[PDB]
């Protein structure tokens, strides 16, 4: 039994990705869109808030049924119980192949009669809340772990008899906190939003892979930012060009399953092309606790990345780096554990102090046998060790997981931000695991 | 599997050297002319190659286990691109070739099939 | 020297050095037979030559 | 380099903590010594292998 908290993240997710294609589309000049706003959190500083709306529709049918809208509804009263400040601008979207386009029918007696909903699942969950119940006993049945079959039936008898009412101002949330507009489905409109994306030069496959989710993410994340002031848009044919730049400058970041398998993939056709030269620098910046079981599998991934990019003793010249997010300490054990399966690695660390010519140093290696000093570079996230990464700069930055970049100069460095879940991932990412 | 590394490389020929008796004792069979090598190139592209000369010595004490080829293709990914424009880089092993690389090279399309031999 | 330096020059052939492993897998495409280069001639002036033949080896 | 094959051991009776402080202070003075320990932990293999030769450069490992 998953939670449900995850579901409706999931629903949000989907309505934050059709809203955001709809402004894509409407995108022609001076748009000034406030995507989103709420990711179900603490702080909520700066509103830049749309509401957290659901798009949910059966299979066909002329009429919305019975009991569904409901659930999100329910959930948005419950939401706005807890709502105050700025105005925060309810909607809830659907699509139906012959339905009224617009604004429906919606003003007091809706809610009325879907108050007077009587299903055991919606009082357990939003209309308890919303409307408390008259009696203590009822009160007592609701705080229960378990809930007999008596108890449920007892629970709706008094929820369809007894008249409760409530002290939220409902009318004042039917005339601004909600909206009803029969929109389009958005599964049969990915067509038309490559037809309308292919409009500049660009290519076939080149929007599906490259362009589109990064105009979805970067349209997405122009209300991530902690300024409020930073949604001031104008001339969006401008703007949509300089995403076209955009576009090609990042070329990553996707979100759904768009032309990508398993967990996450297709950022792997791109990173190929520089992953085939042997004398390259790569720098990795590891934050650990975002990879699942980082301890018992970073030093087989290290085996793995360096029985493959560091096997040749004359091609592969260059040593790898590995900034790990972690103290001082915690060092000495990786070191323990590499040492134990023979693996040759420099921390620059004796104890607690840092050495600048320890860490600099060049591997002396003998080509008549197959020895190299040390095959890789291991240490924490401390300035020192940023300072001779930037005295010795790399050809490419890989950034796993959230890490501060600054402090790093960009000069001639490609910066490759990759997220993953597991090692499986990044070992797929970076061509050294043919399947999952 | 491991065969050698390559010593001279040219646009016509190039020049592989094995690394011990034993391994070319090992795999002498596989070694005559008009049969296949596989040349790395990078981290994950192999130049296919049809070796043409064998010259094994050793006058005094000095073994020399020397191979000619000659690229045919390039093996990109999983996909199979004809030419001789690669030009695989000095130290760089040899690998045989597998029944499944063999097997990818003569797939083409699955209606067009002519089974000869 | 983005590429390499001159080591001979003859009439019909000029004779190119590359520096290093790393330009020549960096630059690998470019310098196939038939590609064009630039030699330096004096302060201002430059000798547009095509490629004929590569030798990659071990001295 | 050529000459001097073999290399001295020095066994002192003190602590773990002690020989970290005079490790610093050989490599402060780019002196390279091998000490066997990884933080607390001693290693045989690494204590009793031989340190490699480069005669061109005057390089010894340890």
């Known amino acids: 039994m998953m939670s449900r908290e995850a579901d409706h993240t999931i629903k949000g997710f989907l309505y934050q990705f059709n809203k955001t294609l709809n402004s894509i589309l409407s995108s022609t000049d001076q748009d000034e869109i406030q995507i989103e706003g709420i990711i179900e959190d603490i702080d909520i500083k700066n509103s830049n808030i749309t509401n957290a709306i659901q798009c949910k529709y059966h299979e066909s049918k002329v009429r919305h049924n019975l009991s569904d809208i409901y659930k999100p509804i329910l959930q948005m009263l419950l939401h706005f119980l807890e709502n105050d400040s700025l105005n925060i601008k309810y909607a809830l979207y659907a699509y139906f192949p012959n339905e009224q386009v617009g604004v429906k029918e919606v003003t007091k007696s809706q809610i009325e009669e879907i108050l007077s909903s009587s299903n055991f699942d919606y009082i357990s969950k939003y209309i308890s809340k919303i409307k408390p119940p008259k009696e203590q006993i009822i009160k007592e049945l609701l705080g229960k772990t378990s809930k007999t079959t008596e108890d449920k039936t007892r629970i709706k008898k008094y929820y369809e008899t007894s008249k409760l009412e409530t002290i939220v101002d409902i009318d004042k949330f039917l005339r601004d906190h909600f909206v009803f507009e029969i929109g389009l489905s958005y599964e049969e409109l990915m067509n038309e939003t490559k037809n309308l994306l292919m409009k500049e030069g660009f290519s076939l496959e080149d929007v599906k892979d490259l362009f589109y989710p990064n105009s979805i993410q970067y349209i997405a994340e122009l209300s991530i930012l902690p300024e409020a002031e930073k949604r001031i848009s104008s001339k969006n044919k401008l703007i949509d060009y300089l995403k076209g730049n955009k576009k090609t400058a990042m070329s990553r970041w996707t979100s759904e399953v768009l032309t990508r398998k398993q967990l996450l993939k297709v950022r792997k056709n791109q990173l190929v092309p520089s992953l085939n030269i042997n004398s390259r620098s790569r720098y990795f910046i590891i934050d650990p606790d975002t990879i699942d079981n980082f301890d018992d599998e970073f030093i087989l991934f290290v085996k793995d990345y360096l029985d493959k990019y560091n096997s040749k003793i004359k091609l592969h010249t260059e040593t790898p780096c590995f900034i790990l997010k972690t103290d001082v300490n915690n060092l000495s054990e990786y070191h323990k554990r590499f040492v134990s399966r023979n693996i040759q690695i420099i921390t620059g660390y004796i104890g607690d102090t840092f050495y600048f010519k320890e860490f600099n140093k060049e591997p002396k290696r003998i080509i008549k046998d197959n020895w190299v000093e040390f095959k890789a570079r291991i240490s924490c996230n401390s300035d020192e060790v940023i300072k001779c990464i930037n005295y010795k700069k790399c050809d490419d930055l890989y950034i796993v997981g959230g890490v501060d970049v600054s402090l790093l100069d960009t000069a001639d460095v490609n910066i490759e931000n990759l997220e993953i879940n597991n090692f499986r991932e990044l070992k797929y990412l970076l061509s050294m695991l043919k399947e999952i | ?117």
């Not at chain 2, 391994?23 to 002319?33: D, H, V």
């Not at chain 2, 190139?41 to 010259?55: S, W």
């Open chain 2, 1 to 117: 599997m491991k065969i050698g590394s390559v010593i001279e490389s040219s646009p016509h020929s190039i020049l592989v050297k094995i690394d011990t008796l034993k391994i070319f004792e090992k795999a002498k069979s596989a070694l005559q002319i008009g049969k296949y090598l596989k040349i790395q190139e990078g981290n994950h592209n192999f130049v296919l190659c049809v070796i043409q000369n064998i010259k094994i010595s050793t006058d005094k004490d000095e073994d020399i286990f020397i191979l000619t080829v000659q690229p045919v293709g390039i093996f990109k990914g999983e996909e199979f691109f004809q030419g001789n424009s690669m030009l695989p880089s000095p130290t760089e092993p040899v690998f045989l070739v597998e029944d499944d690389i063999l097997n990818k090279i003569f797939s083409n399309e699955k209606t067009k099939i002519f089974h000869l031999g």
